[model samples]
Target: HCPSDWYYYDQHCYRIFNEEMNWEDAEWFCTKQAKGAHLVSIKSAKEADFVAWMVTQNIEESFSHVSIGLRVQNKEKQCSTKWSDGSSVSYDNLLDLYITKCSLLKKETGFRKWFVASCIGKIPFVCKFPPQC
Candidate 1:
C-alpha cells in the first residue's frame, strides 16, 4: 500500500509531513489520511536510525521537532511510554535519559536523536503504515 512519494522498506511504508502540528493532531492526521495508519514506530536500532536519517533529509532547520508515534501513559502511579501501534519498544535513541510524555525525534543537529517535548507543541511528523501481510 505504499504510495509513489512514500518510502518503503522492510514491509513498512513511511511518509514525512512538513506541516506543523501537535502530537495528538499529527496522530489524527496520519490515521485519517491513511487507512489504519499511525505515527512511525521504531522497533530496532536500524529502524530508529533510518527514520532519523529520513527526518534529517526532509526537515528544515526552523523545524526542530518531528513527532513520531511514541507517547507516555500513566499507569497506577507509574509512567510508561509505548508506540502508537501498541508494540513494545526495545530500542530508543533518546537524547536525554528523561523525556516528557510525548517524543519528538529531532534531526536539526548534526546528530539525530529523540527528545521529550510537550504534546501540545507544534512540529512536523513522520507516519508509517505497517505491511498488511
Candidate 2:
C-alpha cells in the first residue's frame, strides 16, 4: 500500500522529508501525513541500515542527522525505551556510547549508526508507516 513517492520495503512505507525541523515537530508532522504514521523506527539491523542507506541515495549530503523515533530519557541508562509506534525498541543501532533525548541516524559513510542530539535540533527526518490496502 505504499503511496507514490514513498519508498516501499518489507511490509512498510518509508518517506524522506527534506524539510528541517526539531525532533518533536518532525514526529508531529509524520502523524499528520497519514494514519498510524510516525517518525521512522529502527526495529532491526536490516531495517535500520536499510533506511539509513536509502537516505544516502535519496537525501544525499543535503542534510544528515535525520530524526528518528527513538528518544531516551536518560543517556547513561542505555537507550530506546519505546518508539513512536509505541513498540519496544530492542534493536541497538547506536554508534556513540553516550547520547541525548532525541535520536538521529546519519550515514556519513557506509553504516549509519544512531546518535543522539538535543530534541531542539532542527534537521530533516524520515517517517515509517504501515500501509492499509
Candidate 3:
C-alpha cells in the first residue's frame, strides 16, 4: 500500500512538495523522509507523461515552476545528465530548450512543461518512493 498522501502508479508512491527548496535539500527530504525514496526519476516516456500529469494537478498559484529530480552532469565538454535515482535519462521533452543543469516544470508554460535551471534555485519538487508494504 502507498502512503495516504501519495499517489500510486507502477507499484510506486509519489508526492509533490509545495515548499520551495534547492535541489540538494529536495533530494535530501525525499531520502530522509522514507526508506528507498528519492526525487522522482523518469525512466521512459510512460513515466514522464505520468509524472507530467501528476505535476499538472498540483501547480501552486504563487510559483511559476517546480523542480524535478533530473540534473545535468557538471563535466567539462559534456552534456550528460541523469536522474536522481542514478538512472540514465533517455527521453526529454525539452529538445534543447534548457540552459542549466537542473530540470524544472514550467508551470506558466503549460502542463508537463520542462525547463533547465540552476541547482541553486529554489522550487517546489516531487518525490518518489517504493510502496510502504
Candidate 4:
C-alpha cells in the first residue's frame, strides 16, 4: 500500500493543491511535488483493475476513462499525456479532453474542450507514478 503522505486514489498518487493554478501550472505542481510523479493514470491491464477497485469507494460511475497527468498542449493543441504504455496521445479533435482549467476530466460533449484539473479540485484524479517493484 502507498504511504499516507501519498494519496493512492484512482490507482495513482496526487496532491491536495491547497491553492489554485491554471491547468499548466497545476501540471507543473504535481510534477514538481511528486518527484516527477505528476497526476496519475490507469493505463495498464493491472492498473485498470486497480482503478476499478478505487471507484468502489465512491457511489458514482464505474466504467469511465480518466486522466491523471498534467494538462499539456502538444504542437497540435491537444492535451499532453505521459501514460506508461508509451502510446503517444493523438490529437483527435473528435476525442479531445476538455477546458476545465484544472486536472480533473471535464464532462463535456466534445473531446478537445475537456481538460484535466488539479486534485485540489477534489475531483477524482489518476496518479501515474512508475510501477514500483
* Most lDDT-accurate candidate: 2
lDDT per residue as tens, model 4, 1-133: 4546454644455433324344444456567655446655435656544544443333135323344554444444444553468877663453333434334443242212235543334334444454243
| Model 3 lDDT, residue 96, Cα | 35
**Model 2 residue 66 distance off true place after TM-score fit, in angstroms:** 0.6
- 1-133 per-residue lDDT for model 2 (tens digits): 7788899899899988989999999999999988899999988988977897777777747676688898865644455578899988777676453335787877564537778677778898999899887
> TM-scores of all models?
0.74, 0.75, 0.74, 0.39
Candidate 4 ranges beyond 4 A from true positions: 5-22, 55-66, 70-73, 77-124, 130-133
lDDT on C-alpha atoms for all candidate structures: 0.76, 0.81, 0.78, 0.44
Candidate 4 shows a clash count of 21
* Residue range 40-91, candidate 1, lDDT tens digits: 8888888877787777777777887788887877522224356689985556
Q: Rank the candidate models, highest TM-score first.
A: 2, 3, 1, 4
- Give Cα distance to truth, residue 132, candidate 1, Å: 4.3
Ranking by lDDT: 2, 3, 1, 4
- Pick the winner on TM-score between candidates 2 and 3: 2
Candidate 3: stretches off by over 4 Å: 75-99
lDDT at 27, model 2: 96
lDDT of 2 at 39: 96
